[PDB]
Design a protein around this ligand. Sequence first.
Ligand code: MG
Ligand code: MG
Ligand code: MG
Ligand code: MG
Ligand code: MG
Ligand code: MG
Ligand code: MG
Ligand code: MG
Ligand code: MG
Ligand code: MG
Ligand code: MG
Ligand code: MG
Ligand code: MG
Ligand code: MG
Ligand code: MG
Ligand code: MG
Ligand code: MG
Ligand code: MG
Ligand code: MG
Ligand code: MG
Ligand code: MG
Ligand code: MG
Ligand code: MG
Ligand code: MG
Ligand code: MG
Ligand code: MG
Ligand code: MG
Ligand code: MG
Ligand code: MG
Ligand code: MG
Ligand code: MG
Ligand code: MG
Ligand code: MG
Ligand code: MG
Ligand code: MG
Ligand code: MG
Ligand code: MG
Ligand code: MG
Ligand code: MG
Ligand code: MG
Ligand code: MG
Ligand code: MG
Ligand code: MG
Ligand code: MG
Ligand code: MG
Ligand code: MG
Ligand code: MG
Ligand code: MG
Ligand code: MG
Ligand code: MG
Ligand code: MG
Ligand code: MG
Ligand code: MG
Ligand code: MG
Ligand code: MG
Ligand code: MG
Ligand code: MG
Ligand code: MG
Ligand code: MG
Ligand code: MG
Ligand code: MG
Ligand code: MG
Ligand code: MG
Ligand code: MG
Ligand code: MG
Ligand code: MG
Ligand code: MG
Ligand code: MG
Ligand code: MG
Ligand code: MG
Ligand code: MG
Ligand code: MG
Ligand code: MG
Ligand code: MG
Ligand code: MG
Ligand code: MG
Ligand code: MG
Ligand code: MG
Ligand code: MG
Ligand code: MG
Ligand code: MG
Ligand code: MG
Ligand code: MG
Ligand code: MG
Ligand code: MG
Ligand code: MG
Ligand code: MG
Ligand code: MG
Ligand code: MG
Ligand code: MG
Ligand code: MG
Ligand code: MG
Ligand code: MG
Ligand code: MG
Ligand code: MG
Ligand code: MG
Ligand code: MG
Ligand code: MG
Ligand code: MG
Ligand code: MG
Ligand code: MG
Ligand code: MG
Ligand code: MG
Ligand code: MG
Ligand code: MG
Ligand code: MG
Ligand code: ZN
Lengths: 50, 135, 146, 119, 126, 87, 206
Amino acid sequence: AAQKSFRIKQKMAKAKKQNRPLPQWIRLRTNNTIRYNAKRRNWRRTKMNI
Amino acid sequence: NRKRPVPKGATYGKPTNQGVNELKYQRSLRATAEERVGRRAANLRVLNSYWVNQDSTYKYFEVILVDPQHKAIRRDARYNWICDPVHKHREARGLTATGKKSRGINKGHKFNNTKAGRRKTWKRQNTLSLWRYRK
Amino acid sequence: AISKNLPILKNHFRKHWQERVKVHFDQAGKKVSRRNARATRAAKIAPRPLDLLRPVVRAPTVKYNRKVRAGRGFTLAEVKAAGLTAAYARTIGIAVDHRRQNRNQEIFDANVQRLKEYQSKIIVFPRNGKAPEAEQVLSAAATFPI
Amino acid sequence: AGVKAYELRTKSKEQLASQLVDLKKELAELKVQKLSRPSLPKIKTVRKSIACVLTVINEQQREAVRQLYKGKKYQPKDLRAKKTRALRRALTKFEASQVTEKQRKKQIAFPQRKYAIKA
Amino acid sequence: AKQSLDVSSDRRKARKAYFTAPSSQRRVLLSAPLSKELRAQYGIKALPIRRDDEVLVVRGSKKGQEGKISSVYRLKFAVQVDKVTKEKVNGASVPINLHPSKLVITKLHLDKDRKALIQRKGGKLE
Amino acid sequence: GKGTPSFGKRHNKSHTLCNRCGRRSFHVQKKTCSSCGYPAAKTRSYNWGAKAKRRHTTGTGRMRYLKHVSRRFKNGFQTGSASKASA
Amino acid sequence: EKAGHQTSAESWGTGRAVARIPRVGGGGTGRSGQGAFGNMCRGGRMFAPTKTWRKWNVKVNHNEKRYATASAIAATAVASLVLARGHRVEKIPEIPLVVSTDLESIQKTKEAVAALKAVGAHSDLLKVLKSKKLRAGKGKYRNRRWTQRRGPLVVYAEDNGIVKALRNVPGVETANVASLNLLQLAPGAHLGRFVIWTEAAFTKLD
RNA sequence: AAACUUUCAACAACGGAUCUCUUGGUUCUCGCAUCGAUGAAGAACGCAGCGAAAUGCGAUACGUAAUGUGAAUUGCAGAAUUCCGUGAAUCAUCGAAUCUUUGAACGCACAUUGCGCCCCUUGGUAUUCCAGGGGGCAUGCCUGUUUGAGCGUCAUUU
RNA sequence: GUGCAGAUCUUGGUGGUAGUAGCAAAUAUUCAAAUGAGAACUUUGAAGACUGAAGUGGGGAAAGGUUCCACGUCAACAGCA
RNA sequence: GUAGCGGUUCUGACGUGCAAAUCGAUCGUCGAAUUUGGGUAUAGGGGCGAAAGACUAAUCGAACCAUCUAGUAGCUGGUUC
RNA sequence: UAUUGGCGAGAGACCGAUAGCGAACAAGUACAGUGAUGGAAAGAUGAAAAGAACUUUGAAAAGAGAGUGAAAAAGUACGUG
RNA sequence: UUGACCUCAAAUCAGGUAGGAGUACCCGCUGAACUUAAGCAUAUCAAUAAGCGGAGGAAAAGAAACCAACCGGGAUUGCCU
Ligand SMILES: [Mg+2]
Ligand SMILES: [Mg+2]
Ligand SMILES: [Mg+2]
Ligand SMILES: [Mg+2]
Ligand SMILES: [Mg+2]
Ligand SMILES: [Mg+2]
Ligand SMILES: [Mg+2]
Ligand SMILES: [Mg+2]
Ligand SMILES: [Mg+2]
Ligand SMILES: [Mg+2]
Ligand SMILES: [Mg+2]
Ligand SMILES: [Mg+2]
Ligand SMILES: [Mg+2]
Ligand SMILES: [Mg+2]
Ligand SMILES: [Mg+2]
Ligand SMILES: [Mg+2]
Ligand SMILES: [Mg+2]
Ligand SMILES: [Mg+2]
Ligand SMILES: [Mg+2]
Ligand SMILES: [Mg+2]
Ligand SMILES: [Mg+2]
Ligand SMILES: [Mg+2]
Ligand SMILES: [Mg+2]
Ligand SMILES: [Mg+2]
Ligand SMILES: [Mg+2]
Ligand SMILES: [Mg+2]
Ligand SMILES: [Mg+2]
Ligand SMILES: [Mg+2]
Ligand SMILES: [Mg+2]
Ligand SMILES: [Mg+2]
Ligand SMILES: [Mg+2]
Ligand SMILES: [Mg+2]
Ligand SMILES: [Mg+2]
Ligand SMILES: [Mg+2]
Ligand SMILES: [Mg+2]
Ligand SMILES: [Mg+2]
Ligand SMILES: [Mg+2]
Ligand SMILES: [Mg+2]
Ligand SMILES: [Mg+2]
Ligand SMILES: [Mg+2]
Ligand SMILES: [Mg+2]
Ligand SMILES: [Mg+2]
Ligand SMILES: [Mg+2]
Ligand SMILES: [Mg+2]
Ligand SMILES: [Mg+2]
Ligand SMILES: [Mg+2]
Ligand SMILES: [Mg+2]
Ligand SMILES: [Mg+2]
Ligand SMILES: [Mg+2]
Ligand SMILES: [Mg+2]
Ligand SMILES: [Mg+2]
Ligand SMILES: [Mg+2]
Ligand SMILES: [Mg+2]
Ligand SMILES: [Mg+2]
Ligand SMILES: [Mg+2]
Ligand SMILES: [Mg+2]
Ligand SMILES: [Mg+2]
Ligand SMILES: [Mg+2]
Ligand SMILES: [Mg+2]
Ligand SMILES: [Mg+2]
Ligand SMILES: [Mg+2]
Ligand SMILES: [Mg+2]
Ligand SMILES: [Mg+2]
Ligand SMILES: [Mg+2]
Ligand SMILES: [Mg+2]
Ligand SMILES: [Mg+2]
Ligand SMILES: [Mg+2]
Ligand SMILES: [Mg+2]
Ligand SMILES: [Mg+2]
Ligand SMILES: [Mg+2]
Ligand SMILES: [Mg+2]
Ligand SMILES: [Mg+2]
Ligand SMILES: [Mg+2]
Ligand SMILES: [Mg+2]
Ligand SMILES: [Mg+2]
Ligand SMILES: [Mg+2]
Ligand SMILES: [Mg+2]
Ligand SMILES: [Mg+2]
Ligand SMILES: [Mg+2]
Ligand SMILES: [Mg+2]
Ligand SMILES: [Mg+2]
Ligand SMILES: [Mg+2]
Ligand SMILES: [Mg+2]
Ligand SMILES: [Mg+2]
Ligand SMILES: [Mg+2]
Ligand SMILES: [Mg+2]
Ligand SMILES: [Mg+2]
Ligand SMILES: [Mg+2]
Ligand SMILES: [Mg+2]
Ligand SMILES: [Mg+2]
Ligand SMILES: [Mg+2]
Ligand SMILES: [Mg+2]
Ligand SMILES: [Mg+2]
Ligand SMILES: [Mg+2]
Ligand SMILES: [Mg+2]
Ligand SMILES: [Mg+2]
Ligand SMILES: [Mg+2]
Ligand SMILES: [Mg+2]
Ligand SMILES: [Mg+2]
Ligand SMILES: [Mg+2]
Ligand SMILES: [Mg+2]
Ligand SMILES: [Mg+2]
Ligand SMILES: [Mg+2]
Ligand SMILES: [Mg+2]
Ligand SMILES: [Mg+2]
Ligand SMILES: [Mg+2]
Ligand SMILES: [Zn+2]
């Protein structure tokens, strides 16, 4: 919030990492079951609770 | 006596359970004695306790304990029993004397209801048992 | 809920009774669980015959005193009368009861006699290590019936 | 290729220590390559070995201490056995096999005789 | 009929242990019978196939054909024979998957341990 | 307007992240976790709260040390090392 | 027993134009507000949940049990009944079929099987085999996958290898005399089981 | 007479019924006794050549040591020295270690990657200040070691 | 745990309504060029206005967490595009 | 009398809304018993209340959460060839 | 003697993806709530991706040929439908 | 002045133990109401649910201050009754 504490940055910093699409090579493994990254998060759609 | 805590005296529900001030506590004060030292010395094990004196405000007890990890206790195969882990805080489960009293654990007819242990003998006699070849 | 010429029934199902229903489905399981643990107690326990010896006894009450009944232990006189001591008799498979007493003679002579017969019909091995295999008769209580 | 244990387990106290710095610098350079190359799997079987080395470097000073302590009361908690926190408590055989003298004589007197039935 | 008390005839329990069988368990499973010649050559009926063995497809469409196991694709409970491959439509060539039980072993690839096993089982070898 | 106007000032944190279940149920003013009760030496749970009790019990987690204790038991808390054979 | 109820759902009362079975509360998830508990509710407890204490085993009087096996036995002569029961026994000599006590000693499957065929068994042993079909049910996938017909019963007096020798030829079942079971004596309450009585077994019946 | 409405049919649509499936669930039974201050259960953040997740793991991080096995792993890339061998493997087993930040949680705190004290050692011209490395400091209680207090109190002196 | 038309019954799916109600607050838009398959709506030039410093300006606290910036880009989304 | 606070009347707009309380005009008050941020306190037969049974997170003549709980129902509805 | 927890097993006249545990799937997930808590949906191409080279219309998506296959009346919208 | 004893302290003193989790079963403490009574207060639900303390592979009980009243029995536990 423009002057965070490190506990919030670090949680943001991980949460940013999760915000990528499926690496397209995983769709190709044997028995690969995952189609699309089902957990993707968007900043103006779901707030993450500090 | 024990005073049902119970805010402002309120009880919500039935007349019978409206009582607050002539209540008694099924455990002897001697039992509350062991209890608070047994925790006071959590590593010891309470062997016993004996009353020693009282005024009108306090009853005074002298509890005895047995450090179950001191080698002189661990040997001496007369008290080492205490060292088993099946006697951890035997005061809090009512296994000292006054434990075996306030639990009413004595042989006989005047004791049926509470003799193998009231809650167990209850459950028992309210457990319904059907066989494969019912009877 | 009162109709027809039916008996009045007393069925006490008013607490949460279903909480405590014991369907002995393990009835057979528990048999085997015993049956094995017996054939195994017979193994560990050498040739010894899986139960102690018990005395005769007359039954209490007006009801049962017509019959007679396996006891528990041999009083202190009935063991003395057969010429051994308690402390040893118990190492010979004999159960002794200190809290019994002997006010009846024709049961006194009985147990003593029964006691003698138990020592005749057995053998005691020695303390050493010879270990003579002797095939366990399994039950005293059958071998000296009451 | 890579590093191997038993070949490590016979280097010099200060030789292992040396090869570690080698692997470490080695690693260093790989990571400067990785940012210029697409894929670069060499970088595993090297960061693997720094482990191997460290495992050996620690196992050796460790069993050093294990022995120069082995034999007394009181050695480091982290060399005594783990078992269970409550096993770590139960009496030793000695303690749980004590007998009263009065109970001992009695055991020597009339012990459970090995009897048997028939005739 | 099963007579122990630690074998289960439970269809579900079995299926689950085949498919979630760990690699080192599928190798034995992925076994192939020795060739007719290859069997009296050793006094042994069957063997956990491996890579450089030599094999002939005694079943399947690729009946008749033969060759050398390029790879035991354990993941796939298959094996891949270098010589028996599906040519694609764009001219590429995707290997076909085979099942040892539908092959027959024509020439073992012999090892120190390979041999050992043949002897563990009671086999003679040349 | 008890409603949407007043919702618009919902801009301060009642709870923040519990340092012991990282759960944003750590009441700022009241300094304790509505979920697990930290700093209390014990952990909040209750028999009525049975599903929530299932959400958090031994097993919903890594089980870093309890994982292997059965194994170790299986083998008699072997302290030692394996030797060799061949092959 | 705790199924259907893993909710904390409550009515809505009348007055919301919607029915009034209990309902999950609290939004956010689609299950929110759905029928709860009810026997007709997708997800609820089932009407009259089944119970362990259902009476599975039945008591029978002993002496009419014995009656039942007795009559069973007599039907295993009576070549008529045994004909209608399955059981190809036109090509067997006489009934009851009795074989000499030697059968009780036959260690070897392949041998006994062949000795069975000698004394009349064949066509009925083929009945099995020619009939092992898949099971029509779902039982087909509950450890009951194949459904064959029921072959002969060979009542040995004493067991010297024979019992291990047939256990593996499909449809053939074996029993001592001093047992004798009614589930096998007449499978499915149909009388007339093709029993091949060894001698020693015959005489011990009396 | 079209259109439009309607009905039946064929094909095509919407939907996902049915049938057949089942590495799941249910209940039954048998065996067995092992969490934690030697830091447990839980948590937070990390970790792969190419991962978001599940799984697993901890800065030695999809893993290190050992052992058994006897050639794989596989989505692609890969080494290539690993194939008659202390040796492949996302293999099994597991007895040795590593094991961030935490958690009963223990130097003090904590909505702070906040703030002390001691020892060792290294650099900075330093017993005192600064910086890096190592190692340490919670509470209640039991046994003992030491150091104390009290005309509570026994004796000893001149 | 055996037959459904109903239980403002559960869950899912689907109609008629209906190409209908509607997309009308906050003064307002126009001309070309470029781009592009495609331009009322993008980009630039030109015009007409607006907010009018109690701002439609220049920054911040709480709160959000990458929305910043570049490059590519239009299947979904921005209730025409 | 602005802004600030307020919310009188049109019983104006909206009344499947811009909105689960808004919009327009008109109005009360506008230097203090004024407005208001943040921090902090008070908890459900309890709190707070310049007093309306008001307010206590769209909840108030007794909050929300779970459980006892498939509460009971002489009443309503359904009850499958 | 006890045991709806634990570790390991054998089973069933059980349920068969609106059933059975809430979850057969990255399920106590996603998502909701300040919080206590609440809590879903969702399985099936084929034996094998052989997942459609190439041709042409098209800005693309796609279409029409072709092609693969036992079958496209199986085309990652995938059994039946 | 010197040495003790009793009683209390203090050490990052020498070595150890307690906490927390799990809780199906087990030992305690505390402790309802819904309900039934066709009303309800005793009663019942129930010495049950919620709350609390404490153990183990079982726990607990256990070698009689017992049962009797017999021709007497003879630790405990559980089953049938
Ligand atoms: Mg700021
Ligand atoms: Mg998935
Ligand atoms: Mg009673
Ligand atoms: Mg009438
Ligand atoms: Mg009853
Ligand atoms: Mg309970
Ligand atoms: Mg049971
Ligand atoms: Mg016995
Ligand atoms: Mg007496
Ligand atoms: Mg000897
Ligand atoms: Mg130790
Ligand atoms: Mg330990
Ligand atoms: Mg075997
Ligand atoms: Mg083999
Ligand atoms: Mg593979
Ligand atoms: Mg295959
Ligand atoms: Mg407080
Ligand atoms: Mg704390
Ligand atoms: Mg952990
Ligand atoms: Mg160990
Ligand atoms: Mg070998
Ligand atoms: Mg309610
Ligand atoms: Mg309506
Ligand atoms: Mg259900
Ligand atoms: Mg044969
Ligand atoms: Mg055949
Ligand atoms: Mg059939
Ligand atoms: Mg079936
Ligand atoms: Mg069918
Ligand atoms: Mg029709
Ligand atoms: Mg199939
Ligand atoms: Mg099952
Ligand atoms: Mg926990
Ligand atoms: Mg490290
Ligand atoms: Mg993985
Ligand atoms: Mg080796
Ligand atoms: Mg592995
Ligand atoms: Mg602290
Ligand atoms: Mg810190
Ligand atoms: Mg501070
Ligand atoms: Mg430090
Ligand atoms: Mg001391
Ligand atoms: Mg002193
Ligand atoms: Mg039904
Ligand atoms: Mg129907
Ligand atoms: Mg209808
Ligand atoms: Mg219908
Ligand atoms: Mg009807
Ligand atoms: Mg719907
Ligand atoms: Mg239109
Ligand atoms: Mg219109
Ligand atoms: Mg309008
Ligand atoms: Mg415009
Ligand atoms: Mg312009
Ligand atoms: Mg102007
Ligand atoms: Mg202007
Ligand atoms: Mg102005
Ligand atoms: Mg700014
Ligand atoms: Mg933001
Ligand atoms: Mg931008
Ligand atoms: Mg588009
Ligand atoms: Mg948008
Ligand atoms: Mg649009
Ligand atoms: Mg205003
Ligand atoms: Mg207004
Ligand atoms: Mg109006
Ligand atoms: Mg209108
Ligand atoms: Mg005005
Ligand atoms: Mg009040
Ligand atoms: Mg009240
Ligand atoms: Mg109160
Ligand atoms: Mg009023
Ligand atoms: Mg609300
Ligand atoms: Mg309100
Ligand atoms: Mg209330
Ligand atoms: Mg609220
Ligand atoms: Mg009902
Ligand atoms: Mg009425
Ligand atoms: Mg089905
Ligand atoms: Mg389901
Ligand atoms: Mg059904
Ligand atoms: Mg569900
Ligand atoms: Mg599945
Ligand atoms: Mg489908
Ligand atoms: Mg086409
Ligand atoms: Mg077809
Ligand atoms: Mg098809
Ligand atoms: Mg396609
Ligand atoms: Mg299918
Ligand atoms: Mg110390
Ligand atoms: Mg505890
Ligand atoms: Mg009470
Ligand atoms: Mg009450
Ligand atoms: Mg009730
Ligand atoms: Mg009533
Ligand atoms: Mg009534
Ligand atoms: Mg009433
Ligand atoms: Mg009452
Ligand atoms: Mg009570
Ligand atoms: Mg009462
Ligand atoms: Mg309770
Ligand atoms: Mg334990
Ligand atoms: Mg036992
Ligand atoms: Mg005990
Ligand atoms: Mg005595
Ligand atoms: Mg007795
Ligand atoms: Zn917490």
